Subunit: 290 residues, 4 copies
């Protein structure tokens, strides 16, 4: 028996992505791409999904919620899930605890006002943590996170309190020669992030980044994503296969075609189930409690 | 039912590009590559266009006009359109108001003395704005710009006055948790620039930039460009599909071949119309006014 | 006659590589990747190796030995070799001679404890030497190293005492215009490292490095690795063909697929012997003494 | 009819390149790649050329001469041409006038003692000039340089005295809004360098460079080189098609294979003539004097 849970996760980075993460704060041109992502990118992603009758989870920065209100209505009315993703896409590790907690509070408030329900899902901007577990569980709603990478194609419960010894070369070796020390499992389910199922780093060009790419072939990317799916399909009976995309990138014509090949390849397989992240979190919590 | 407007926008970066944008000001070797683009590159692209009976718009830095006067004659005499592109490829955002204005004055004077008419088209060097909209409309002529990215395959009127709140981590979150505020549309038409339709960053090698590439395959890029065309053709009845190239890069034999594949593919389609950017601007001004 | 010795060398970088080399010491997201590599990665490479009945050598950081004890047990039970690889993946050049010596002792202590025998093989973290060659022979055990690049498909005896003159542009040219002066062979066998046979740089994404890649296609790399083998099989009668992998990278489904191709292709060839690094070293020491 | 002059230019960077250009001066591991290039790389490229009965020019750093004397004898006895390439691959633009002149005097001295005749050919390390034109013509011998890029597939006489105005944003625009002023042709013939016909930047990995690559596919590079040859052959009656390689890179098995494909493709075409750079230079001097 094959139970393959498959989801698209859309991080609406848009203008917020350029303020917090990708260095576009003083660039009109970069800001204009942020606006493309919302005004042009969200609806093309909705048409793509509507075409294959797919559900999806949208992780939306508070900035994008208030900057693209008309497209936000289009997202809710399609019956899709809205999750959290900062306000202006700020990297949590760079914020104070109060700044991070305030950002999360505003996000919940903005999503609740938009959907009627509190968000249950989170993606940390640029995928970085801090004391986020404690904050997510504390700020109610939050059932699951899609930011961490302890695993691949299986959800798990996130541990709080892991520690490790950093190398300090001004000391002697015995001071840092100690093994990572595992913390304690919490109720936050992880639906793992994955750089190999992330449209943005290979296919978006960023001048302000030393590790920007942007000109990797979408056919090579699609093919790689598809090889990942085939392997998962061949090796695992239950699995979650989630793809992280951004209207910024995946609503560009060349990678829209890529997604059509991916979806159409996945749909050739029996035992596939297109779902939202909340449904994965619900199913996993029911699959193995504790 | 198909009206696909298709154009080459040739930015004659040549030497100007290396003085203003690409860090070659102290490199005899980079400077000589600049001379290749003017002396060798302009005639090879002209031969390319003549072969397929294509029109084109050349956006020429004042530096290139005065450094390659004989190649300039070849561009005019072929009946192609000439637009502005700085003098020494200066990034507008680093310039003063007067410097940027002076640059713009000189560009206009030079193109007028060369062609007989004032330019109607502008490309910002390295695609960066500042307060350019206002200057383009003030310095007469300028009908259209090809620097911005609010859209990809549909022109639009450029808004002046968009504002946004930068993240300041020395303050509290509420100080930057505000949306982008849209300004007001001017009569400046935008014929969108697109990093995904720009020969230079993937296929020009630059020692002085850490986000240089240069060795992305021209067959992949061409295939990507054609995929962009095919999606546009399948989804839209009216569209403008403009390609930004440089003699620097697109006059290298391996990408001259690439363009031949592209042009021959585009030419298989009904409803294609090869045009200048000015013709797109005029056609757009007539299509939807205000 | 053909004797083609083929081997997999697994550097279990994991959490250690992020601590020592890849900038992830202040990143919960990167540490999470580290733990993937050890908890999921290690058993998937074992399933692969066992699928083709292959031996392997695992060059294991002390930090990984102690952080992943259940996976260590699994490595020894399968009968694979365990070589040394620092503790927290520290660069031998950044360390005091005492730190370095203390790192090598603790490694040796940990591996003996685990296996019953002292290690005979070493890989230097991030592939650098310093005064290692003396320390490796001195710390008894060590027969062979797999860090250096004087050759590629033939082992050789590591020379000690090589020196060269650096360019100081403050002085005159005659002060630095001198050749490299070769030292003297030692008994340390080199089983050469090779950037062209290393899964990590092309295919792990790292933001903390400007020299990072991550999105080079695994199909392109697999092809390039087979091409290397294809030339070798055709041009040499005796050869060693070792591939450096990491559970970090080679336990990702798309790279596992890559390896399956590489392995099956290599098994079409007769004269091929799948061995451990210790067996290559032993072979070499028999092949040509002194 | 068809006279396509085709040559390999082998720059023996080896250890010199790591001292002078690629940041390996403090790296035992990089130095070993340097030694690989000389000890293993030169003979493999000699076996390659001999197989197809090809002549070649080796542009050899004095550092490589004195460090690989036995391989230097192999290059001479194979009857190939020897040109200059710095001592420790030093960038001319970084050197004093005296250092650069001293470096050049020593190179001439070493090459003469090695071959019997003074060198006629020069490649600037890392391809940069300064006041080299004057020194190459002053330091007798030197007939041709292969460092500059004013053209790609036609030789030319190098101009001395080119000048241009740099951008200084502390002044007004009119201060720098002036064209490049061409100087005057000298007798130095250029057989152009070309980043698109250079094996090293796409396929050698350099940790010290932010602009390093190293993992671009050799099949893509080979295909790109064959596309260049195919266009030149289709478009030109007389042309020089010279390829720059390094034992460092092109003596790697995956790239030897690439070259075999390249050479075999070129040999199918009529009018091809494999020559040394010296023969190209002489042919050019005879083709058009002045
Ligand atoms: Zn995001
Ligand atoms: Zn430009
Ligand atoms: Zn390692
Ligand atoms: Zn060189």
């Amino acid at each position: 028996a094959k139970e393959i849970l498959v989801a698209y996760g859309v991080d609406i980075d848009a203008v917020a992505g350029w303020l917090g993460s990708y260095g576009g704060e003083d660039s009109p041109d970069d800001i204009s791409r942020g606006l493309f992502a919302g005004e042009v990118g969200i609806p093309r992603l909705l048409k793509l999904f509507k075409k294959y009758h797919l559900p999806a989870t949208w992780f939306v920065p508070g900035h994008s919620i208030e900057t693209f209100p008309e497209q936000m209505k289009m997202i809710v009315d399609a019956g899709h899930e809205v999750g959290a993703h900062g306000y202006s896409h700020e990297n949590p590790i760079a914020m104070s605890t109060k700044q991070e907690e305030d950002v999360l509070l505003k996000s919940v408030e903005l999503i609740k006002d938009l959907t009627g329900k509190a968000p249950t899902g989170y993606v940390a901007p640029w995928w970085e943590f801090s004391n986020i577990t404690n904050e997510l569980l504390l700020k109610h709603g939050f059932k699951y996170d899609h930011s961490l990478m302890h695993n691949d194609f299986t959800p798990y419960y996130v541990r709080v309190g892991d520690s490790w010894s950093k190398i300090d070369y001004s000391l002697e070796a015995k001071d840092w020669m100690k093994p990572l020390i595992r913390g304690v499992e919490t109720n936050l389910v992880e639906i793992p992030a994955n750089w190999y199922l992330d449209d943005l780093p290979p296919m978006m060009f960023i001048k302000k980044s030393p590790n920007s790419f942007g000109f990797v072939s979408p056919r090579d990317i699609g093919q790689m994503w598809i090889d990942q799916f085939d392997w998962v399909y061949r090796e695992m009976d239950y699995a979650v296969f989630s793809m992280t995309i951004h209207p910024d990138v995946s609503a560009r014509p060349q990678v829209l075609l890529m997604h059509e090949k991916i979806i159409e390849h996945i749909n050739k397989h029996e035992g596939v189930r297109w779902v939202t992240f909340n449904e994965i979190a619900d199913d996993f919590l029911k699959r193995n409690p504790r």
